[PDB]
Design a protein around this ligand. Structure first.
Ligand SMILES: OC[C@H]1O[C@@H](O[C@H]2[C@H](O)[C@@H](O)[C@H](O[C@H]3[C@H](O)[C@@H](O)[C@H](O[C@H]4[C@H](O)[C@@H](O)[C@H](O)O[C@@H]4CO)O[C@@H]3CO)O[C@@H]2CO)[C@H](O)[C@@H](O)[C@@H]1O
Ligand SMILES: [Cl-]
Ligand SMILES: [Cl-]
Length: 414
């Protein structure tokens, strides 16, 4: 008679934080909530195994980009009633509302839980020593490359590591997602997929998509990303920025919360980076400013034996008080627009920078096939990183890889 909820690791002690969050719900409803944490690397497989077997929790977290795929399997309970109780369409950013459903579907299948978007963390101390004005460096693509050139030339050394800092750390290992690449594709005027003629097709091989992708990967090729970074994944690069190896690195808003937590508690409060932390939005590309905007939603399996209490929990987790409290514990942003006004978010100057970048937030379409698109894109992007690791990424070779990515994506989408 326990409600069961599956979550990902959204906070340093993620189960304890989730239990603290729901204790008022448990007391008001006379029920216990049992939480299971799934690592982000394995969550998709465990959630899809529950969807196919009918054995699983009442509720699951879903990354926003997963909602279409899980909804298309016909295993999610409608939640238009819950979203109505929370304020309906009006209560959310369009970028958040669009993740409540499979695109074109009638009925919502997911409740917004938290939002996140990407921006650049930078070392305030390293840019000052390099003579870089952050407002110029993060204005434009030309600004960004000029600032990296100045950071490469800098004699600055981290006070702890006593060594120079990489201008930019970005991972070169085959990525799990396009989160890092997408702003450069978009800033150039391109897109991952495009809807035309009542079908979706790859646009990764568009002149504009190839422009942004080449710009981004050539920064590594030009000496602004150290060879060692190419051999790392996102978690390893995050550790490198925290350990004082990187002047600039792109991530979500949670690293602000982690900068106030001791290392022994899973943050980096003691590190120089934590004490010299800036944030700047992605620079304007040729065709405008964009960043990846995502987050997580909650879904109810239609095979749950506790749908009535599970919907009350969704209403609780989706509502103002729990919205504020969980974003405070995780370092994410509320999903619910009203909750953004809390002074805990507005008066935090680093998080305010994320708040202002949300105007340029861009999302993926909520497609049934999205996983398969992203998986083919990332496997080809990996091959392009391997060329960067040889100094052999040319425009010709990047186009050849993206034409192959585009053939396989169009096959999958058909
Ligand atoms: O693509 C699916 C989905 O992605 C969402 O973005 C997720 C990322 O997928 C995920 O890798 C990222 O994970 C963070 C996590 O939130 C932090 O809590 C975690 O914090 C760590 C800490 O940084 C570590 O030092 C320590 O080891 O433990 C704690 C956690 O216990 O750091 C990781 C690493 O980046 O979280 C992203 C935001 O949820 C998108 O939002 C969504 O749209 C996509 O659908
Ligand atoms: Cl990438
Ligand atoms: Cl896109």
């Amino acid at each position: 008679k326990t409600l069961e909820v599956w979550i990902m690791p959204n906070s340093p002690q993620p189960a304890e934080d989730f239990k603290a969050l729901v204790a008022p719900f448990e007391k008001a409803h006379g029920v216990e909530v049992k939480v299971t944490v799934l690592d982000w690397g394995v969550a998709w497989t465990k959630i899809t195994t529950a969807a196919t077997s009918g054995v699983g929790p009442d509720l699951t977290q879903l990354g926003t980009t997963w909602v279409g795929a899980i909804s298309a399997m016909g295993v999610l309970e409608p939640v238009d009633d819950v979203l109505e109780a929370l304020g309906g369409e009006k209560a959310y950013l369009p970028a958040v509302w669009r993740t409540t459903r499979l695109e074109g579907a009638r009925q919502a299948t997911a409740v917004p839980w938290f939002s996140e978007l990407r921006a650049f963390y930078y070392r305030t101390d390293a840019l000052k020593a390099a003579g870089v004005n952050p407002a110029e460096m993060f204005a434009s693509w030309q600004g960004f490359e000029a600032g990296l050139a100045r950071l490469k030339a800098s004699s600055f050394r981290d006070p702890e590591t006593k060594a120079p800092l990489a201008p930019l750390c970005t991972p070169g290992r085959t990525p799990r997602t396009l989160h890092n690449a997408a702003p450069w594709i978009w800033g150039a005027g391109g897109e991952i997929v495009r809807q035309a003629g009542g079908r979706w097709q790859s646009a990764l091989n568009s002149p504009e998509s190839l422009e942004g992708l080449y710009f981004f990967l050539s920064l590594a090729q030009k000496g602004y990303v150290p060879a060692e970074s190419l051999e790392k994944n996102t978690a390893q690069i995050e550790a490198d920025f925290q350990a004082g190896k990187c002047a600039v690195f792109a991530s979500g808003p949670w690293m602000i919360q982690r900068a106030q937590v001791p290392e022994a508690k899973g943050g980096f409060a003691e590190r120089t980076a934590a004490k010299n932390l800036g944030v700047a939005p992605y620079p304007a590309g040729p065709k405008g400013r964009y960043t990846f905007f995502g987050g997580s939603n909650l879904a109810l399996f239609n095979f749950s034996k506790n749908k009535p209490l599970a919907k009350e929990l969704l209403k609780y987790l989706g509502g103002p008080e729990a919205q504020v409290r969980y974003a405070q514990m995780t370092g994410m942003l509320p999903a619910l627009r009203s909750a953004w006004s809390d002074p805990s978010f507005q008066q935090n100057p680093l998080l305010r920078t994320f708040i202002q970048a949300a105007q340029f937030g861009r999302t993926y379409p909520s497609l049934a096939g999205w996983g398969g698109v992203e998986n083919l894109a990332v496997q080809h992007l990996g091959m392009a990183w391997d060329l960067v690791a040889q100094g052999r990424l040319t425009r010709e070779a990047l186009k050849d890889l993206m034409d192959k990515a585009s053939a396989a994506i169009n096959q999958a989408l058909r």
